[PDB]
């Protein structure tokens, strides 16, 4: 029967069929060792001279990389085989051969060449591992919020920023965040999350944005920690093979899986960064009141062994909708979660204003057109409750978990100001 | 302890707390009957004069619609209560009152007024039911493909159609479909699906687009049937309450849940439509070679009790990438799945060309710029295998399952050429 490499362990000592591609090939003495990929994994297939028809042995001599292939054989358990299993091949059929030379030979090229060939490069071991971890995270996000009674709530992408021309003279704008709509959602369904593209490194990325009715700042941070540690735990448990293919040290991820994330106020974070900047030539000072520069963010991130929260920034550098700190008028009740190892911010969140007049005056103080926000103001006129939410950047989270050098590797086909292709 | 209405059955005869909103209110004799919503459901709460402090009874006299509320009481099982349960209230605390008159009183307004107030209207019973069914479908899609070893594969939205201005003079275009990228995905991961927004009724909608390596036309239709019948079954099993709130007859959905969907060739469909058009004044004739007009689609859809497949259309009215019918050169191996009851197309799919030169000449015959499709052509140069896929429109599927009058009701904040707000 036809099976997939991913399920090969369930078929030990049976005759099966694989359909896929020649990933690698080597020979020693009377054995050809093929590495086959079928899209769900990589598996050694042996072709043994004298134990298969000579035509089959010779045909298996004759296979360039990315030859498409059907192979038939017996599943063998064998710890000398990478994976722990191999296919003892009995028959083999070429489905197609490359028209030209395949552009990506093993262990050769630099990362940019590989990303220019992204549509082919996705087939290889490292992008395979990254994408399977990405899939694992997206599924696990839906399970995490589904099991807690959250409703997925798709925020609009077109908004009345990148500008889009509509029919006639009309113009719309690509969403940078579904949060405002998610708040309407939270007031209708108690607990919701968007899971969609937003547009601002990457021009285009994916954001999970939960909003919860009656939820406070502190509960908001607790929810963030709960989610991130669950996701790291889930990758550790189910994608340990992919982590291994990436050369990712699980020990760098285990603290995140256990929670108890350290927290810092903005003031404390600034003081810390400026202590670091004195003993360290490669970290510049940080004047109070400014947002964290890239080196500052990195220095904070590398200080801890798991994600670190930074909360209660100055109002002056945050958004109009954020709830003011009740014991400190210059600050708002917000938080950013920083991944360790220099990966930096993976979550941005806050408690939102629930008082009608406060929100009116904030909409003015921030010099905003009140009319366009009237519906948003309705959320305070009718059934207003304290509520909070946040947005998790999927690509930065993937990049961190996988240990990638750049976020563009975390998404199948990245869009950046420079590369917009394929 | 604080609980949600959705979990109320697990807490019979316990003292609990609810946090939510006054949805409706009526009184008879010494009982105030509140209908509370907390975002996860609707629940009767009784306040009994003489058994609660007089202040509490009087406070509960005093509650306009969308008053935000905390209520404490004992969960009672009671079939006279709608839901089968009610809260016997002991204490109650107003969290907030409406600033102004709430614009949506029960059983009053026309659909357009309600959609103009969509951000508030989402709180009510019918949109509640629709959105919970939508959530059920999105979760179930991830489970269906996750359990079959499909990988979620996010296709880019920005493409090199709606036009978007980038920095400098550069321009991109909102994706109308992730299929081309999904094919690269299928060749890398065997079986994939996009789950994302596309842009073309609705300007913006959600598409699940599976692609499978080595999969044929016939298997493609089998996969489509399997998926749709699973989704209908899943809504029937887990959202029967929401279906009931919608007044949706489960009997209209049960045939879809069982599969065995009828199939028609394009030629057969045309002949059928034209037979229908003779006995029926409200169905116009259909010349051979034309795509199905709206009345034709509707007449086909209303002919059957479950979704119907239409396959093997003329090449001349389909896309460049579609595999030609091997026994009939004028036709391609494609299919559209039509929902019954006049809802029409919910899936469009086909087998794709895997032969390199055939695809080159099709790219020319269709007058297309070969350069921009070179990467796509690489998918035929290297590791080319027969493959197929399709796209399921989420909103049309929701609209059909819920029995809605228009697809705009199937998405939280619809974008149409006319309404772009909120």
Curated annotation (Swiss-Prot), chains A, B:
Keyword Ligase set for record: yes
PROSITE patterns the record matches: AA_TRNA_LIGASE_II (PS50862)
Cellular compartment(s): Cytoplasm
SUPFAM superfamilies: Class II aaRS and biotin synthetases (SSF55681), Nucleic acid-binding proteins (SSF50249)
Reaction equations catalysed: tRNA(Asn) + L-asparagine + ATP = L-asparaginyl-tRNA(Asn) + AMP + diphosphate + H(+)
EC number per UniProt: 6.1.1.22
GO cellular component, one term: cytoplasm
Enzyme category, top tier: ligase
Keyword vocabulary terms for this entry: Aminoacyl-tRNA synthetase, ATP-binding, Cytoplasm, Ligase, Nucleotide-binding, Protein biosynthesis
Record-linked Pfam families: tRNA-synt_2, tRNA_anti-codon
GO molecular function annotations of the record: asparagine-tRNA ligase activity; ATP binding; nucleic acid binding
GO BP terms: asparaginyl-tRNA aminoacylation
PANTHER family referenced in this protein's UniProt entry, alphabetically: ASPARAGINE--TRNA LIGASE, MITOCHONDRIAL-RELATED, ASPARTYL/LYSYL-TRNA SYNTHETASE
Subunit details: Homodimer.
Family: Belongs to the class-II aminoacyl-tRNA synthetase family.
Protein name (record): Asparagine--tRNA ligase
Gene source species: Thermus thermophilus (strain ATCC 27634 / DSM 579 / HB8)
Gene: asnS
């Amino acid at each position: 029967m036809r099976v997939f490499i991913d399920e090969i362990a369930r078929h030990v000592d049976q005759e099966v069929e694989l359909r896929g591609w020649l990933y690698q090939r080597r020979s020693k003495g009377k054995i050809h060792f093929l590495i086959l990929r079928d899209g769900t994994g990589f598996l050694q297939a042996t072709v043994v001279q004298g134990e298969v028809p000579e035509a089959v042995f010779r045909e298996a001599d004759h296979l360039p990389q990315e030859t498409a292939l059907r192979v038939w054989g017996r599943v063998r358990e064998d710890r000398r085989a990478p994976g722990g299993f191999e296919l003892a091949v009995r028959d083999l059929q070429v489905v197609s051969r490359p028209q030209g030379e395949y552009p990506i030979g093993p262990k050769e090229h630099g990362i940019d060449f590989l990303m220019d060939h992204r549509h082919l490069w996705l087939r290889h071991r490292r992008p395979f591992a990254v994408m399977r971890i990405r899939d694992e995270l997206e599924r696990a996000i839906h399970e995490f919020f589904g099991e807690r009674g959250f409703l997925r709530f798709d925020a609009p992408i077109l908004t009345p920023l990148f500008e889009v021309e509509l029919f006639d003279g009309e113009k719309a704008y690509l969403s940078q965040s579904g949060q405002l709509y998610a708040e309407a959602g939270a007031l209708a369904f108690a607990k919701v999350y968007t899971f969609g593209p937003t547009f601002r490194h990457l021009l285009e990325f994916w954001m999970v944005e939960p909003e919860v009715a009656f939820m406070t700042h502190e509960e908001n941070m607790a929810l963030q920690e709960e989610l991130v540690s669950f996701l790291v735990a889930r990758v550790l448990e189910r994608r340990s093979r992919e982590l291994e293919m990436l050369g990712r040290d699980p020990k760098a991820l285990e603290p995140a899986a256990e929670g108890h994330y350290p927290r810092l106020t903005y003031k404390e974070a600034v003081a810390l960064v400026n202590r670091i900047a004195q003993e360290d030539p490669e970290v510049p000072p940080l004047p109070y009141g400014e947002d964290f520069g890239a080196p500052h963010e990195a220095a904070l991130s590398r200080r801890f062994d798991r994600p670190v929260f930074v909360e209660r920034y100055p109002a002056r550098i945050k958004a109009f909708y954020m709830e003011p700190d009740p014991e400190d008028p210059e600050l708002v009740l917000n938080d950013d979660l920083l991944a360790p190892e220099g990966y930096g911010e993976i979550i941005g969140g806050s408690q939102r204003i629930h008082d009608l007049e406060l929100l009116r005056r904030k909409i003015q103080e921030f010099g905003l057109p009140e009319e366009v926000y009237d519906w948003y103001l309705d959320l305070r006129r009718f059934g207003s409750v304290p509520h909070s939410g946040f947005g998790l950047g999927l690509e930065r989270t993937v990049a961190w978990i996988c240990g990638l050098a750049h976020v563009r590797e975390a998404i199948p086909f990245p869009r950046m100001y420079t590369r917009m292709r394929p």
